Every structure is written in C-alpha cells, then in structure tokens.
C-alpha cells in the first residue's frame with residue numbers, strides 16, 4: 001500500500017460539486033488525484049465499472065454495546081456491520097455499561113476500535129454523570145480524550161438547566177449536544193400513542209414528548225449559542241418546529257432513522273417487538289412528513305440509531321428492549337427514496353457523507369485532495385436478503401429481517417485499505 | 423332605574439363594527455337601542471359629550487388577594503380600582519390563601535363580590551390541588567361553581583403530563599387553561615437575566631424559562647385540542663412561538679401586561695422593587711417586539727396582572743414580592759400606543775373588550791342589543807396623577823406612582839347602574 005486506483009466507477013462527491021466517470025488515485029491512505037483514465041506503475045486496482053463511487057458513509061448514531069452488553073453486539077461486530085453497510089466512520093452512543101462518562105471508557109473504546117481496524121469509531125460522552133440526569137459530566141476531560149459530542153441517549157434530560165448548562169459548556173468547547181428528545185412524563189410506555197396502542201392497550205409514548213423537548217432544545221440552542229442535534233426525528237410537528245428554529249439561524253441539526261421512513265406503528269402488528277423502538281414508529285402522516293423533510297432539506301442526515309438487542313429481548317412487546325439494527329440496511333432503505341424519485345442520488349450521498357461530517361465537525365465525507373481515502377463503492381440495483389447468511393450483527397432485531405433489499409455495498413475503503421468487499 | 427340614556431358621546435363597539443356619535447338607551451340593566459338623539463319620558467341622563475363610549479373593559483388577570491392577603495387589597499378595594507379604571511368585569515387569580523381549589527373559596531368570592539356590587543368578579547380555579555403542582559384540581563366541581571378557567575398562577579406547572587391532563591380535562595369542560603409560563607429551573611431568581619442582573623449580581627430569570635413553557639403549551643394545546651391562554655407575554659421569541667402555533671389553527675391566546683409595554687429591566691434601577699415582577703421586565707428589543715405583537719394582532723388582549731403588594735414587601739429587590747398594580751393605569755398606559763399612532767382607538771378598545779370576552783367565552787365586551795349594560799365612558803386626553811389622592815388600591819406598587827398619566831375614565835356603568843364617576 002503506497003498506491004491504489006479506483007477505476008471506471010461513477011464518482012459522486014457532493015462536497016466538491018464533483019460527479020462523472022473518474023478514476024481515483026490513492027497515495028499513503030490519502031486522496032491524491034481524481035481524473036479520467038489514471039494509470040500508475042505497480043498500483044493496486046479495484047474495478048468499479050458499473051458502480052457508484054463516493055466518500056465513505058458516516059453514521060453519527062450507533063450503539064456498539066461495548067462495554068457491558070457485548071452479547072448484543074461489540075466494537076468488532078458493529079464495525080463489520082458498519083463497513084458492510086458502507087460506513088467508514090461511526091459515532092458510538094454512551095449508554096454502555098459502564099457509560100462513557102469518564103476517560104477510561106473513552107480510551108478503552110478508542111484502543112479497541114484501533115485494534116479492530118475497520119472503521120473509525122468516534123465516541124460521545126454522556127451529558128450527565130452516570131447518565132442519571134442530575135449532574136453535568138466532565139465535558140472538558142471527555143472532549144480532550146476524543147469525545148465528539150455529548151448525549152444522554154437513550155435517556156432524555158428532564159431538567160431544563162441541566163440541558164442549558166450542557167449546551168453552554170459544550171459550545172464553549174466547540175462540540176454539539178445530541179439530544180434524545182422524549183419527555184419522560186409523556187413517554188414512559190412502549191409504543192406510539194396512536195391506533196395500535198388504542199387497539200391493544202399497550203402503554204404509549206406521546207408524540208408531544210418528543211416535540212416539547214425539541215422545542216425546548218431549539219430555544220436553548222438559540223439563547224446559549226450552542227449547537228443541538230436532534231436525534232431520530234419522528235413526527236410532522238417535530239419537523240415544523242426544527243424548521244422554525246433553522247429559519248432563525250439557530251444551530252439546530254437533525255437526523256432521521258431510515259426505519260421511520262419505512263415503517264409506521266402498524267409494523268408493531270406485523271413484526272411485534274422488532275418494531276418496538278424509541279421514539280416509536282408513528283403514523284402514515286408522520287412517515288410521509290419525514291420523507292418530505294428529507295426532500296426539503298429539513299432533515300440534515302440519515303443516521304441509523306443501530307440498536308441491537310437479542311431475540312429474547314424481543315418477545316412480548318411490553319417487556320421488549322426498544323431498538324432496531326440498521327447499519328447494513330441503511331443504504332437500500334435510503335435507496336427506496338431514490339427509486340421513487342423523491343431524492344437524487346447526489347442528495348442520498350450528501351445525507352450519508354458531507355452532512356453528517358459537518359454536524360460533528362470532522363473533515364471527512366469528502367473526496368477532496370489530501371483527505372483520508374475513505375471511499376464507498378456500491379450497486380444501487382443489487383438485490384440481497386438480510387438473514388443468517390448475510391447478517392454481521394450479533395443481533396437480528398429489524399422488521400427488514402428476511403426481506404428483499406435492493407442496493408448493496410461492493411467495496412468499502414478506509415485510509416486506502418479495502419476493509420470490506422461483497 | 424327602568425331607563426337610562428348615554429347622550430352625545432362617541433360610541434365605539436368593535437364587536438358590531440359600530441362607531442359614530444350615537445346615544446344609548448338602557449332598559450332594566452340591558453342595552454335597548456343605539457341611535458341618533460334618543461329621548462324618552464322620565465329617563466336618567468348622563469352626558470357623554472366630548473367623551474368616548476364603549477363596552478365595559480374586561481381584565482382577565484387580576485389579583486384580589488382575597489381571601490388571605492387582604493392587607494394587600496381585597497375584593498372591595500380591587501373592585502373599586504377595577505371600576506375606576508373602566509373595568510366592569512375582572513377575572514381573579516386563584517393564588518389566594520386558601521387558594522381557589524374548592525367550591526367554598528369560589529362561593530366566598532362570588533358572594534362577597536355580589537355584596538360589594540361594583541364589577542363582575544369571575545373566579546378561576548387552580549390547575550393543581552393546593553397549587554402544589556402535583557395533582558389536578560377538581561375542575562368539574564370548580565367550573566360548576568363558576569370558575570371560568572384554571573391556572574396555577576403565579577406558579578408554573580412543571581410536570582408535562584400534569585399540564586396535558588389539565589388541558590384535557592379543561593377542554594372536556596369547555597374552559598381554557600391560563601398558564602403562568604416560567605420553567606422553575608431557569609426562573610428562580612428575582613429579575614430578568616439581562617444587563618441589570620449582570621451589573622448588580624441579582625439572581626435572574628431566564629427568558630427561555632417563559633419561552634420553553636409557551637412552546638410546550640402550544641404543542642399540548644395542539645395535541646389535546648384544549649385552549650391555552652398564555653399570561654403576561656414578555657419576550658420577542660415568545661411572540662414568535664405563539665404566532666407559529668396560531669398559524670396552525672391551535673387554540674392558543676395571549677395577553678400583555680401594559681407595564682411590559684412601558685418598562686424594561688432598566689426600570690429596576692429607577693424604581694427598585696416596584697419594578698420586580700414575574701415574568702420580569704426584559705430588554706428594549708422585547709418591549710418593542712411586544713408593541714409590534716399588539717400592532718400585528720399576535721397579542722389578543724391587554725390584561726393587567728394587577729398584583730398588589732405592600733411597601734414593606736417592596737424594599738430590597740432580593741426580598742421583594744414580585745408584582746405591579748395596574749387596574750387604574752391600564753387605560754392611560756394603553757393610550758400611549760394610541761398617541762404614538764401604533765394602534766387605532768378601535769383596536770385599543772378591542773383589546774379591552776371583545777377580545778378578552780372571547781378568550782373566557784363570556785357574552786360581554788359588547789353593546790349588542792339585549793346584552794348587559796356594561797359601558798365605559800372615557801376621556802383619552804384627561805391628565806391625572808396616580809398618588810394618595812387618586813389611588814384606590816390598598817397598595818402603591820407601580821413605577822407609574824406619582825407620574826403624569828393621560829387618559830382617564832369619566833364614567834363606569836355596570837348593568838345600567840353608574841358604579842364609578844370621575
């Protein structure tokens with residue numbers, strides 16, 4: 001590995017308004033040149049003919065379950081999922097055990113991720129000590145150790161001064177707060193407060209629980225000057241509120257879990273506990289609004305909230321752990337919107353690359369000369385099935401289990417090294 | 423009293439798009455006819471020549487301090503203030519002692535107000551038992567006894583399900599929630615979080631405390647179908663948020679304390695503790711936004727939050743009770759906006775009459791044929807001073823104490839009976 005060439009693919013680099021049939025030369029893990037028919041003496045070649053070539057995808061919302069819940073997933077299994085899904089960078093959430101609220105846990109993750117060596121794993125810290133919601137965590141030490149953001153995911157912050165103080169201390173450090181928006185007085189049940197909760201009598205989680213905290217966060221972001229990133233947006237009103245603050249110049253970004261683009265609460269009737277997730281799958285009108293928010297640029301990126309749980313944690317809905325895996329299914333799920341002509345291919349790539357890069361302030365999601373050779377190569381049309389043959393997660397918890405997907409990664413490249421191939 | 427005629431005044435009844443020089447005939451406490459030069463055998467006459475004749479003003483935010491704090495004010499002293507200020511109807515707040523959370527306190531107030539016999543006093547109930555914020559109050563019994571709305575004024579409701587449940591049970595009964603919007607984690611100091619708190623080191627109350635709860639209430643109103651009325655709006659962002667929900671068809675109304683139209687936090691430096699109020703007086707930009715919200719119809723009515731406290735409760739700002747009296751000063755204060763050409767005279771009257779009537783769902787604030795003869799007659803140009811000679815409150819707590827006011831009530835009429843004259 002001095003020299004690599006990605007030949008004959010259809011390159012798309014939205015960060016540079018760059019697209020067409022170009023080759024890419026990689027030198028020492030870095031992007032060296034992008035040009036028609038490049039040829040160099042003694043080069044590694046991967047042939048991308050008929051395929052899409054773009055920056056490595058970045059997922060800013062992943063649960064690696066490591067430390068403490070490694071029977072669900074661990075840094076290795078999650079990293080394999082990531083790269084098999086086209087991700088060269090993932091941000092891991094801090095609801096591990098022990099939680100990421102000290103530099104020992106950060107370092108453990110960084111070192112283990114280096115040993116695994118497939119994608120870049122960027123840790124976040126908790127907003128509060130122990131994620132108990134009471135006292136701000138040591139942002140200064142956690143950022144210095146490598147945390148890129150603070151969240152209490154998957155717990156909301158209930159005290160408004162705690163959230164304000166988080167935003168103040170984080171912005172002072174130049175990093176965002178990622179907020180898990182669900183007021184715990186209005187969201188302590190198991191599924192959406194809609195038709196399915198009404199029909200079955202399952203306890204519910206009110207859409208206002210999410211909306212009220214998003215509105216709170218926009219106001220706090222506005223008044224503190226901090227940047228708040230809203231995780232897994234799930235309702236129409238939510239998007240309206242976000243846009244209202246974006247219109248004012250507030251540093252508020254957001255993401256959508258592709259599952260919320262594909263499924264409604266009705267999925268609880270078809271997939272049972274594999275449709276239990278926080279925030280819940282909500283109504284048709286919400287699903288369609290989300291797609292509209294993707295189209296209109298209100299939703300800044302796709303992020304999986306890859307949240308693996310074992311099958312015995314996905315039995316009776318009432319007792320089931322919330323969450324859906326998604327790293328391996330993000331791309332075909334997104335490509336569904338491309339196929340319906342809702343978004344362009346460039347737009348889909350933006351949402352996986354440069355947009356998430358800008359949210360967390362990393363110079364990635366790009367094929368700019370001199371930048372790391374993180375490259376994803378994919379077939380928008382290749383069909384496959386997520387099943388035992390194909391699943392890289394330790395867990396299986398997704399309503400897309402066993403269903404036909406269209407769109408698939410052929411190559412994932414990280415610092416000029418092929419870390420995944422079909 | 424069979425027959426009364428209000429002669430030669432300039433009548434304005436915005437509810438009917440009615441204005442001009444007309445006489446008003448009153449028969450048995452009711453409006454009988456409105457016409458040019460009416461004359462009837464053996465009639466009482468009050469001459470309104472050169473004066474403005476309009477429906478009695480309604481103030482939907484008054485502290486009567488009765489029961490329990492009658493050294494501040496009582497039903498009698500507050501009613502005299504009301505009528506001297508042009509108000510034939512006031513809504514009293516439930517932060518009395520004991521608070522209005524049972525039908526005994528409601529009935530005491532209704533009966534005492536009947537005995538006093540000057541203006542109609544309409545009680546509200548608390549949102550929570552004891553106003554402690556934990557358990558919803560008995561709305562059903564309180565409404566049946568005569569309460570027209572529920573509020574925990576001057577305490578916010580901190581639990582979101584409590585507020586949601588209040589809105590649900592109130593809308594079921596057809597009555598609004600009036601919410602005192604100030605998140606207690608962000609508003610536990612004494613003055614605005616602005617220049618004056620920074621300069622002096624007085625504890626502060628963050629504008630976001632108000633904004634976050636208004637945003638919460640709009641969302642709750644939207645999702646429950648209830649009507650929420652936002653009390654004493656004080657910031658620019660607040661008005662933006664309200665308008666955002668009004669635009670969506672949400673039943674959300676609001677009011678402005680005229681003091682917030684006249685004064686900023688700087689008044690704490692000139693008037694000391696008589697400028698201590700919740701929500702606080704904020705910045706110039708907020709003051710001007712409020713005036714703009716009055717102009718653009720975002721603010722639905724004027725309401726005084728008449729909040730009397732004794733002089734010994736208005737000494738060192740840190741220990742002072744929050745609040746400003748305002749019933750006698752509301753009209754000249756409002757007329758300041760008329761004089762600057764910010765609002766028309768019709769608009770000023772709307773904000774004191776039909777708009778507050780519609781908020782609380784009473785058929786008042788009108789000179790419609792058959793309706794109660796509640797009539798206010800005033801001189802927009804008459805100068806006076808609020809001082810010992812002129813004050814009808816038991817308390818003196820207003821930065822307008824001793825200052826020249828322009829605009830003054832000459833007559834107040836309630837059910838055809840003259841209850842006040844200059």
Ligand SMILES: O=C1C[C@@H](C(=O)O)NC(=O)N1
Nearest residue numbers: 063154277278307322323
């Ligand atoms: O907020 C969350 C956290 C997550 C998890 O399992 O970590 N699963 C979810 O469904 N929602």
Ligand SMILES: O=C1C[C@@H](C(=O)O)NC(=O)N1
Nearest residue numbers: 485576699700729744745
């Ligand atoms: O919320 C409130 C209540 C009031 C009072 O004294 O009742 N005074 C105020 O200044 N704000």
Ligand SMILES: [Zn+2]
Nearest residue numbers: 093153154305
């Ligand atoms: Zn998560």
Ligand SMILES: [Zn+2]
Nearest residue numbers: 515575576727
């Ligand atoms: Zn009040």
